mmCIF file of C-alpha atoms (C1' of nucleotides) in Angstrom:
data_model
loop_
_atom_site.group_PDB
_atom_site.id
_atom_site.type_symbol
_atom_site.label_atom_id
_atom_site.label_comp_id
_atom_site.label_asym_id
_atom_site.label_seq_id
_atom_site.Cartn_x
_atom_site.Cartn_y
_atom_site.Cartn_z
ATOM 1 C CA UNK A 507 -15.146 192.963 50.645
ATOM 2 C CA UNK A 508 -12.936 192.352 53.616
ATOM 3 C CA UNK A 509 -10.295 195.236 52.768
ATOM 4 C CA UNK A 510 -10.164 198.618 50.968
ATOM 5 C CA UNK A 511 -13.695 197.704 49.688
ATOM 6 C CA UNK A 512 -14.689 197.503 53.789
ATOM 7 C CA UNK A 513 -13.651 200.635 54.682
ATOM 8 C CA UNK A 514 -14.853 202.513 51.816
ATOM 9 C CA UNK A 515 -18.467 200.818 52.291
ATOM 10 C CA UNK A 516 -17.863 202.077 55.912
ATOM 11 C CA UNK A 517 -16.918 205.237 55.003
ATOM 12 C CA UNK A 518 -20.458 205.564 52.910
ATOM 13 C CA UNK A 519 -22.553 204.058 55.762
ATOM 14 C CA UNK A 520 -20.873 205.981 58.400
ATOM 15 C CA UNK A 521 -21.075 209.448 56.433
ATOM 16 C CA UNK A 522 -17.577 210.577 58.040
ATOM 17 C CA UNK A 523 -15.317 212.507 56.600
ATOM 18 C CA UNK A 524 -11.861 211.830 54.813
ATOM 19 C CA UNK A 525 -8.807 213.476 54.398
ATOM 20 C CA UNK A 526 -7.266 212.983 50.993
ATOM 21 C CA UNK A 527 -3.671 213.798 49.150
ATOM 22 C CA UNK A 528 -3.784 213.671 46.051
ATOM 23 C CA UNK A 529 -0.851 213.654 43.272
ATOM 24 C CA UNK A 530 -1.304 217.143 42.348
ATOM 25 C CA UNK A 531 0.513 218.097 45.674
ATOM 26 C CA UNK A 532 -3.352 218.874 46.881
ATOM 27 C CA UNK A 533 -5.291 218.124 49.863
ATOM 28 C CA UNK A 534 -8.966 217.713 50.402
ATOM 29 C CA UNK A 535 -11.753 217.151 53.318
ATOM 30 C CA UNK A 536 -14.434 215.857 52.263
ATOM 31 C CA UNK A 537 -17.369 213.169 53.126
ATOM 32 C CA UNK A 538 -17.956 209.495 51.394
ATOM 33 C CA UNK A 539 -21.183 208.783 49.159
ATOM 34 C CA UNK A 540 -20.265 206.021 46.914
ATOM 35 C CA UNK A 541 -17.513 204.285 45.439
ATOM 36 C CA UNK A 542 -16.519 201.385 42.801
ATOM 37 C CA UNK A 543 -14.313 198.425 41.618
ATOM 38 C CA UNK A 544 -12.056 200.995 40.513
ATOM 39 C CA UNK A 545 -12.665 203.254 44.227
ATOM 40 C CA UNK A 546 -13.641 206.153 42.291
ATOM 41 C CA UNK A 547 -15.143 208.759 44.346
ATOM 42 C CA UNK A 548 -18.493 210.493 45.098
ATOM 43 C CA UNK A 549 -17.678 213.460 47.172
ATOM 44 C CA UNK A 550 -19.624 216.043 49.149
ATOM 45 C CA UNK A 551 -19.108 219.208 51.709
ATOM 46 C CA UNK A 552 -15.489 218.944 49.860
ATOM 47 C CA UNK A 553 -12.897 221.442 51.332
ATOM 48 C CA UNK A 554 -10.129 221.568 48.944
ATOM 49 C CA UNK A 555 -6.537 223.333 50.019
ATOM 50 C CA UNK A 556 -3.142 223.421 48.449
ATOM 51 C CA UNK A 557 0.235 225.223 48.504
ATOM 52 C CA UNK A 558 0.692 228.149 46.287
ATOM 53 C CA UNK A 559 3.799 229.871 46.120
ATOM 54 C CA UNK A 560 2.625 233.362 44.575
ATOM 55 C CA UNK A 561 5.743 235.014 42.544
ATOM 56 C CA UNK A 562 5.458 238.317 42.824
ATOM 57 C CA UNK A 563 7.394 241.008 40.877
ATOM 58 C CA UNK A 564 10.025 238.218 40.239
ATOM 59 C CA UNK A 565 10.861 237.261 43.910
ATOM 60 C CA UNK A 566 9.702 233.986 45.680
ATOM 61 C CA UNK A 567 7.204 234.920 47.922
ATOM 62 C CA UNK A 568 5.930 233.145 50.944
ATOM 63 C CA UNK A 569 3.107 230.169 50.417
ATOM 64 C CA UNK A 570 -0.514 230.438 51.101
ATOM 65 C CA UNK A 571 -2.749 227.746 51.614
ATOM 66 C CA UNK A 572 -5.093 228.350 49.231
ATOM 67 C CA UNK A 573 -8.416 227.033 49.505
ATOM 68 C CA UNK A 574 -11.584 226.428 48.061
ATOM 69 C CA UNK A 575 -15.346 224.591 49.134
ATOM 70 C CA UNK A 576 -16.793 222.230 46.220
ATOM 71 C CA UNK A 577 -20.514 221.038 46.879
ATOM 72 C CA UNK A 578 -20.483 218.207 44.840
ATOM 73 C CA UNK A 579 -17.604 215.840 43.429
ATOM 74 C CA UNK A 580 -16.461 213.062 42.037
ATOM 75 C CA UNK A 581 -12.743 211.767 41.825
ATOM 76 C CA UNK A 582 -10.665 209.355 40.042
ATOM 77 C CA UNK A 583 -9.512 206.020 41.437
ATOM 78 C CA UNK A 584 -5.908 206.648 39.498
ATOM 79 C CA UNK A 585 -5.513 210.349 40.976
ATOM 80 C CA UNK A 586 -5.040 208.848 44.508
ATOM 81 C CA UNK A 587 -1.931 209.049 46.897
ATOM 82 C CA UNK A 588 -3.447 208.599 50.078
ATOM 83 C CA UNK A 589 -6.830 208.755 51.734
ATOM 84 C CA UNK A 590 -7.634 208.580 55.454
ATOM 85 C CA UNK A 591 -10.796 208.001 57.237
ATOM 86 C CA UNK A 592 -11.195 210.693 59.946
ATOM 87 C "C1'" U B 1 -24.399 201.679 23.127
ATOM 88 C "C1'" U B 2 -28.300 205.170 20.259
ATOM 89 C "C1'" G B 3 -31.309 208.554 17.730
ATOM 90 C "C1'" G B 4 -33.343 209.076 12.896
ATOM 91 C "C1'" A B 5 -36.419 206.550 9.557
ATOM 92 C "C1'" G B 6 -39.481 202.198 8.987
ATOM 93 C "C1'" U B 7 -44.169 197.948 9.565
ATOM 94 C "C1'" A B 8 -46.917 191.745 8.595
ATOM 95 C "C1'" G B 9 -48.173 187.608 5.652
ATOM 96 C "C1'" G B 10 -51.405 185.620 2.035
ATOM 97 C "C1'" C B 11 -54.316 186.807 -2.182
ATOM 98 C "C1'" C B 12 -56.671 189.774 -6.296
ATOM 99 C "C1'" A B 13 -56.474 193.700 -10.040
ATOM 100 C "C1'" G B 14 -53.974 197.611 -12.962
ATOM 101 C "C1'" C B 15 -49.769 200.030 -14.964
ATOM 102 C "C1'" U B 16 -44.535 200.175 -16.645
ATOM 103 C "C1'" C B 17 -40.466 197.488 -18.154
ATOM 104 C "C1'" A B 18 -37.904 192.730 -19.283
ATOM 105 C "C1'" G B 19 -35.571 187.643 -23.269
ATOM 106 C "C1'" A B 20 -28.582 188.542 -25.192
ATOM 107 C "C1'" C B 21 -31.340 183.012 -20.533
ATOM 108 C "C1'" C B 22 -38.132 186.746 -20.258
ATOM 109 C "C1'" G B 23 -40.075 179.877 -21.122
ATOM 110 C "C1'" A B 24 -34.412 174.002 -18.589
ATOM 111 C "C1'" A B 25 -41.277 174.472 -22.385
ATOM 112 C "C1'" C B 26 -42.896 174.810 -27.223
ATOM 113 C "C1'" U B 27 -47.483 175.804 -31.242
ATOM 114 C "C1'" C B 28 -49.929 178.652 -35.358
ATOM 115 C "C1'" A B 29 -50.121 182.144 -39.233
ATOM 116 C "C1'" U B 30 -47.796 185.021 -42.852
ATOM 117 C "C1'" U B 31 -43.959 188.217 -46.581
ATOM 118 C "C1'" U B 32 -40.350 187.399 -50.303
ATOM 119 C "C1'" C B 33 -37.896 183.100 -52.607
ATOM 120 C "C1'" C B 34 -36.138 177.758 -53.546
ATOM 121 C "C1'" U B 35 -37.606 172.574 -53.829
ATOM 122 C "C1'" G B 36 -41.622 168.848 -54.123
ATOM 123 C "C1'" C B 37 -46.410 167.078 -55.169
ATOM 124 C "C1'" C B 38 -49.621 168.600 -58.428
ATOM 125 C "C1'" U B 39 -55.883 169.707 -64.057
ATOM 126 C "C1'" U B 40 -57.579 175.060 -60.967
ATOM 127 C "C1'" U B 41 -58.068 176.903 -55.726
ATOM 128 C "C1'" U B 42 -58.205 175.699 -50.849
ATOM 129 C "C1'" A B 43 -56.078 172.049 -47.568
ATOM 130 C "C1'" C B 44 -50.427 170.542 -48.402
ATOM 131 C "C1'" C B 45 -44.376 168.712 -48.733
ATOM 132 C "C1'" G B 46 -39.752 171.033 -46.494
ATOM 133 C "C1'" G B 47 -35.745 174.412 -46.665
ATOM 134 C "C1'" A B 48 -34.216 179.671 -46.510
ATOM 135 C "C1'" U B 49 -35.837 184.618 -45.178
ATOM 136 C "C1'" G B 50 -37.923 188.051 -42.425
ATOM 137 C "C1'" U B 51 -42.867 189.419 -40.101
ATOM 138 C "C1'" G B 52 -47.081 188.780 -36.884
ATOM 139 C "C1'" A B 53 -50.232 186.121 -33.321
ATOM 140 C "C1'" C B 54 -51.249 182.746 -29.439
ATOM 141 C "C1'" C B 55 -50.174 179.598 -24.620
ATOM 142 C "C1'" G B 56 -47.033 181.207 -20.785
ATOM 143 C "C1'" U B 57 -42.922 184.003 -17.339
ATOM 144 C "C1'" G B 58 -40.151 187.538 -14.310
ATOM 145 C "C1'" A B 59 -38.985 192.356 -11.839
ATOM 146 C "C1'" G B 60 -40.631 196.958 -10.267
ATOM 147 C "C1'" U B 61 -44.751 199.847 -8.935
ATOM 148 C "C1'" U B 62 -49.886 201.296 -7.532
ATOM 149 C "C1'" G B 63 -54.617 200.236 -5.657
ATOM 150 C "C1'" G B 64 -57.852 196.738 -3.251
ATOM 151 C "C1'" C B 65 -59.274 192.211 -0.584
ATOM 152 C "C1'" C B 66 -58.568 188.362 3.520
ATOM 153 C "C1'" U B 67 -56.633 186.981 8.202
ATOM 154 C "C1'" G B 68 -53.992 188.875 11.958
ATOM 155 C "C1'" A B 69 -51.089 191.811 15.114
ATOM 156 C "C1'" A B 70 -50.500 196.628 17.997
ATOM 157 C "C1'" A B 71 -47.676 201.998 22.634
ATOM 158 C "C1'" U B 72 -45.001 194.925 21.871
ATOM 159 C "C1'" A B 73 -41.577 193.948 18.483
ATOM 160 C "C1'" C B 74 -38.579 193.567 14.497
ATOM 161 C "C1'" U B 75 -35.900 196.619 9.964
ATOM 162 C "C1'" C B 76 -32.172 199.775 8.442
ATOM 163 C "C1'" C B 77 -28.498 203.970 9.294
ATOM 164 C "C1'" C B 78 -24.877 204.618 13.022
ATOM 165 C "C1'" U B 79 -22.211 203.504 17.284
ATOM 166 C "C1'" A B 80 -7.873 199.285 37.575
ATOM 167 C "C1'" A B 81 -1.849 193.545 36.112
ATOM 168 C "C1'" U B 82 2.756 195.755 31.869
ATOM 169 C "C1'" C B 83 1.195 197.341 25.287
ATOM 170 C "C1'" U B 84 -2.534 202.350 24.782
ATOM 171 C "C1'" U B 85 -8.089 205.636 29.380
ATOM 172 C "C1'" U B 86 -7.114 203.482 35.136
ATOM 173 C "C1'" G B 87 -0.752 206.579 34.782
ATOM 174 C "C1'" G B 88 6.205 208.700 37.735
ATOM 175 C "C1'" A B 89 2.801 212.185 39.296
ATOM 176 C "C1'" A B 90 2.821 217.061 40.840
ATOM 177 C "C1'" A B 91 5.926 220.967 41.791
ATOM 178 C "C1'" C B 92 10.302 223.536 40.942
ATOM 179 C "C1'" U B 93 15.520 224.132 41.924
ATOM 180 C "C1'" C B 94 20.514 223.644 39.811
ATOM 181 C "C1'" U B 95 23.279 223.792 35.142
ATOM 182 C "C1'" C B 96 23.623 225.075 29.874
ATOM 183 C "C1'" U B 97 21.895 227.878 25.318
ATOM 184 C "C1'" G B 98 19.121 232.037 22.933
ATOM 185 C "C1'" G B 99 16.429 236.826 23.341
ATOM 186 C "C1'" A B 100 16.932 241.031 26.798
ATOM 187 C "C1'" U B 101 21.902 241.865 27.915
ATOM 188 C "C1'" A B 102 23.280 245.605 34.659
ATOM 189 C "C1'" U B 103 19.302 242.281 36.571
ATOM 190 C "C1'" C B 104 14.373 240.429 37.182
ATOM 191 C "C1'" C B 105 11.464 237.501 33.818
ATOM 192 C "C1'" C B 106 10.742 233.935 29.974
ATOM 193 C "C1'" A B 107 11.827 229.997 26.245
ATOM 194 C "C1'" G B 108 14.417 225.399 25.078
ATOM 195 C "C1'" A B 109 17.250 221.337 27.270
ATOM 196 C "C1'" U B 110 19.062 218.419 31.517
ATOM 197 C "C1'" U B 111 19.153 216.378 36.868
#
RNA sequence: UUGGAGUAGGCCAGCUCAGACCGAACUCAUUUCCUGCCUUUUACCGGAUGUGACCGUGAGUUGGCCUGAAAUACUCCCUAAUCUUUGGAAACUCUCUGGAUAUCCCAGAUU
């Protein structure tokens, strides 16, 4: 209650946003609802973007940052690598 | 952790089974014989042998009675410190093998 638990209890009083990575090489933006023991996460207005490299006809193309908008979510304490509180 | 199926206790009455221990208890009668006592019978003696009755018992089941209780409850069926669900991930190169075999791709294996 005076570490990890403090921010993420700020993070749900506050409503602001966080920036995740996450150890499928993704990236997410996002806003804080909830969260646990465990810091699992209640997520909403979640803006989710990762690296794609498309291979087209055999040849390495260039990467795209594709993205996608979630309206509701919830994550997984053990998924984590790093969160930020923007 | 649940849904599904359940509903008390006491008492009374009926029905069906139960002895190899229904019964940690114990009587009576009687068949066919043997013994005894006997003038005839009944009422008897006491052994065998089967056969009935009577005083009782248990389990299941069905109906009723009495007192409650009442969306309560019980009853069944069923259900993040290492070592397992709280992570070394994710991504993909290089090399090797096979198919294709000029390559791309892909599979397996390794860093």
């Amino acid at each position: 209650a005076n570490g990890p638990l403090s921010l993420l209890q700020t993070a749900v009083r506050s409503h602001t946003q966080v920036l995740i990575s996450v150890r499928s090489g993704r990236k997410l933006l996002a806003r804080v609802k909830a969260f646990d023991r465990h810091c699992n996460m209640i997520l909403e207005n979640v803006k989710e973007m990762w690296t794609e490299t498309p291979v087209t006809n055999g040849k390495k193309g260039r990467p795209v940052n594709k993205d996608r908008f979630i309206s509701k979510m919830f994550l997984r304490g053990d998924s984590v690598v790093i969160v930020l509180l923007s």
